[PDB]
Design an enzyme around this catalytic site. Structure first.
Site, PDB file in Angstrom:
ATOM      1  N   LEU A  77     -26.755  98.878   1.926  1.00 46.47           N
ATOM      2  CA  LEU A  77     -26.136  99.465   1.068  1.00 46.47           C
ATOM      3  C   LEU A  77     -25.414  98.554   0.075  1.00 46.47           C
ATOM      4  O   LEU A  77     -25.585  98.694  -1.197  1.00 46.47           O
ATOM      5  CB  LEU A  77     -25.274 100.755   1.530  1.00 46.47           C
ATOM      6  CG  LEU A  77     -25.885 101.956   2.106  1.00 46.47           C
ATOM      7  CD1 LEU A  77     -24.556 102.942   2.490  1.00 46.47           C
ATOM      8  CD2 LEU A  77     -26.750 102.862   1.303  1.00 46.47           C
ATOM      9  N   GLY A  78     -24.870  97.804   0.486  1.00 44.04           N
ATOM     10  CA  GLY A  78     -23.902  96.805  -0.195  1.00 44.04           C
ATOM     11  C   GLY A  78     -23.697  95.588   0.707  1.00 44.04           C
ATOM     12  O   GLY A  78     -23.714  95.368   2.132  1.00 44.04           O
ATOM     13  N   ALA A  79     -23.066  94.552   0.072  1.00 42.60           N
ATOM     14  CA  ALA A  79     -22.901  93.251   0.678  1.00 42.60           C
ATOM     15  C   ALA A  79     -21.925  92.292  -0.059  1.00 42.60           C
ATOM     16  O   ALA A  79     -21.731  92.506  -1.074  1.00 42.60           O
ATOM     17  CB  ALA A  79     -24.345  92.121   0.904  1.00 42.60           C
ATOM     18  N   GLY A  80     -21.019  91.795   0.858  1.00 39.39           N
ATOM     19  CA  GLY A  80     -19.601  91.347   0.347  1.00 39.39           C
ATOM     20  C   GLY A  80     -19.225  89.912   1.005  1.00 39.39           C
ATOM     21  O   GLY A  80     -20.048  89.476   1.868  1.00 39.39           O
ATOM     22  N   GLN A  81     -18.035  89.838   0.900  1.00 40.63           N
ATOM     23  CA  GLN A  81     -17.655  88.387   1.334  1.00 40.63           C
ATOM     24  C   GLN A  81     -17.332  88.743   2.782  1.00 40.63           C
ATOM     25  O   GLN A  81     -17.364  87.561   3.603  1.00 40.63           O
ATOM     26  CB  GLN A  81     -16.270  88.219   0.567  1.00 40.63           C
ATOM     27  CG  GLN A  81     -15.426  86.969   1.233  1.00 40.63           C
ATOM     28  CD  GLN A  81     -14.110  86.702   0.433  1.00 40.63           C
ATOM     29  OE1 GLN A  81     -13.787  87.338  -0.277  1.00 40.63           O
ATOM     30  NE2 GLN A  81     -13.300  85.753   1.127  1.00 40.63           N
ATOM     31  N   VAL A 111     -22.705  96.810   4.363  1.00 39.97           N
ATOM     32  CA  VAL A 111     -22.677  98.374   4.687  1.00 39.97           C
ATOM     33  C   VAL A 111     -23.961  98.796   4.813  1.00 39.97           C
ATOM     34  O   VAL A 111     -24.736  98.669   3.797  1.00 39.97           O
ATOM     35  CB  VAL A 111     -21.851  99.224   3.641  1.00 39.97           C
ATOM     36  CG1 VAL A 111     -21.821 100.564   3.759  1.00 39.97           C
ATOM     37  CG2 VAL A 111     -20.208  98.685   3.584  1.00 39.97           C
ATOM     38  N   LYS A 153     -20.140  99.934   8.861  1.00 41.07           N
ATOM     39  CA  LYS A 153     -19.679  98.625   8.051  1.00 41.07           C
ATOM     40  C   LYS A 153     -19.585  97.445   9.001  1.00 41.07           C
ATOM     41  O   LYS A 153     -18.794  97.490  10.055  1.00 41.07           O
ATOM     42  CB  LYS A 153     -18.332  98.979   7.520  1.00 41.07           C
ATOM     43  CG  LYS A 153     -17.504  97.651   6.770  1.00 41.07           C
ATOM     44  CD  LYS A 153     -16.196  97.944   6.267  1.00 41.07           C
ATOM     45  CE  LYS A 153     -15.794  97.684   4.942  1.00 41.07           C
ATOM     46  NZ  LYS A 153     -16.675  98.169   3.761  1.00 41.07           N
ATOM     47  N   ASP A 171      -5.308  98.508  -0.442  1.00 51.39           N
ATOM     48  CA  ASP A 171      -6.295  98.413  -1.241  1.00 51.39           C
ATOM     49  C   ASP A 171      -6.837  99.416  -1.995  1.00 51.39           C
ATOM     50  O   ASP A 171      -7.750  99.816  -1.694  1.00 51.39           O
ATOM     51  CB  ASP A 171      -7.457  97.283  -0.669  1.00 51.39           C
ATOM     52  CG  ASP A 171      -8.190  96.613  -1.751  1.00 51.39           C
ATOM     53  OD1 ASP A 171      -8.017  97.008  -2.800  1.00 51.39           O
ATOM     54  OD2 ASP A 171      -9.038  95.869  -0.997  1.00 51.39           O
TER      55      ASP A 171
END
Ligand code: VSE
Ligand code: CA
Ligand code: CL
Length: 423
Positions: free
Chosen positions: A185-189, A193, A207, A292
């Site tokens: 679904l998504g990629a980050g630092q 996900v 996650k 956050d």
């Protein structure tokens, strides 16, 4: 000898759980929480069942118009949900008068449009002292044939919604082999996900955490609330996998920038803010901290319910969402989360726009040093902006509580005196 009846249909997907349909009766053999052991009178089989799918026979939950454990605002949200019409009603537990009940009815008035009004039910039962009924059923039947003092005549009950199926018993820590991460679904630092599947039978979202980036999670799982994303299971071997419920409509931000989200009216945005404030109020009461808060960490369900995500996660490991005392001295508290909620409120009312447009982080910090705050958007109500401003106070102690913010946002279009109608 306890006997229950099934409120909803259910298809078994585990080893020893039981399949049943609505109306079916069962014999309770053990009560272990979310999962009860029972014996179906229809199939004579003994097995586990979701406790929240059944209820004692001829009890109040068994009625199509009774909704147990629902607040006034939740009642209003459910009644205004799709598939409901004029006169749609429900009877529920009074959240302010413990031990008694209340009636919520769908109405209409040309000034506000579709509305939901609530009457107190006094105990026999009566709403108006002139008319007294032996049972609640007699009351509804009465108010179905004429409104005799109500704002609307009762029609059909409110549309029920099938509750979430309980997670596998004693399955907090799971082996990775039970998961099939089907779509990124998504990629980050710090990780990714995925849209996965648990034991080929349950759709979930996981996650994945980079190895560089358990106790805290064991705390997180105790924070169970309708406005927080439910945290089902975890994989304890690096890389750590956090298995939670799958929110069909993704993040709040992306939704607000979507077209459907662009079709969302102002009261709907305010409602979103009320839900988020409710969840943050829950976290507040539990003396926890988010660390956050922003539209990116708010998820949306297919039914347009907002749920707080990634709460507390920032600790274990966005200056524009961060309070000045948190930026300067690293003082993270619930009040800094109130500040962040102000910024989020601005995000919601501006349909996903980035805070302080045309300003870099240090520029923003130096602006805050001057006592600068974001101006009021054209389509933003003055009072809502006042709420934002109260969230954006230099002294954290002078910032409102999430309880208060929730109370204000819930009844934003309703005068205090007009919460419950008297007859
Ligand atoms: C361009 N956009 C595309 C969309 N991307 C977003 C990020 C992936 C999506 N996303 C993320 C999540 C997600 C998953 C697990 C998680 O873990 C915790 C929960 C509570 C407390 C602590 C940790 C937190 C969040 C998610 C979801 N559950 N169900 C559905 N979607 C989910 C929502 C969209 C971001 C970038
Ligand atoms: Ca106004
Ligand atoms: Cl029996």
């Amino acid at each position: 000898r306890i006997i229950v009846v099934a409120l909803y249909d259910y298809e078994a997907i585990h080893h020893e759980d039981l399949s049943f349909q609505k109306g079916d009766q069962m014999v309770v053999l053990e009560e272990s929480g979310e999962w009860w052991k029972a014996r179906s009178l229809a199939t004579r089989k003994e097995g586990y069942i979701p406790s929240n799918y059944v209820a004692r026979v001829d009890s109040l939950e068994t009625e199509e118009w009774f909704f147990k454990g629902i607040s006034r605002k939740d009642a209003e949200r459910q009644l205004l949900a799709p598939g409901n019409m004029l006169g749609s009603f429900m009877i529920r537990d009074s959240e302010t008068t413990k031990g008694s009940y209340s009636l919520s009815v769908r109405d209409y008035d040309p000034r506000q449009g579709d509305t939901v009004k609530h009457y107190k039910i006094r105990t026999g039962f009566y709403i108006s002292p002139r008319s007294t009924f032996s049972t609640l059923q007699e009351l509804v039947d009465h108010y179905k044939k004429g409104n005799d003092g109500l704002c609307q005549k009762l029609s059909v009950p409110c549309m029920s919604s099938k509750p979430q199926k309980p997670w596998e018993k004693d399955a907090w820590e799971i082996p990775r082999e039970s998961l099939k991460l089907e779509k990124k679904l998504g990629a980050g630092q710090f990780g990714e996900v995925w849209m996965a599947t648990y034991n080929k039978h349950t759709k979930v979202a996981v996650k994945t955490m980079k190895p560089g980036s358990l106790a805290e999670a064991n705390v997180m799982k105790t924070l169970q609330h309708d406005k927080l994303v439910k945290l089902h299971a975890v994989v304890t071997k690096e890389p750590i996998y956090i298995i939670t419920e799958f929110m069909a409509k993704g993040s709040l931000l992306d939704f607000l920038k979507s077209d459907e989200g662009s079709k969302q009216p102002l009261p709907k945005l305010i409602d979103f803010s009320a839900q988020i404030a409710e969840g943050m109020a829950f976290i507040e009461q539990r003396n926890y901290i988010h660390r956050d808060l922003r539209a990116a960490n708010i998820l949306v369900s297919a039914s347009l319910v907002c749920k707080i995500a990634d709460f507390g996660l920032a600790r274990v490991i966005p200056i524009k969402w961060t309070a000045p005392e948190a930026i300067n001295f690293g003082s993270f508290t619930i009040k800094s989360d109130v500040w962040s909620f102000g910024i989020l409120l601005m995000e919601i009312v501006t349909y996903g726009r980035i805070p302080y447009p045309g300003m870099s982080n240090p520029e923003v910090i130096r602006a805050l040093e001057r006592g600068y705050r974001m101006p009021r958007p054209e389509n933003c109500p003055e009072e809502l902006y006042n709420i934002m401003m109260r969230c954006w106070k230099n002294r954290p102690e002078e910032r409102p509580t999430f309880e208060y913010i929730q109370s204000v946002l819930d009844d934003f279009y309703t005068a205090t005196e007009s919460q419950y109608e008297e007859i």
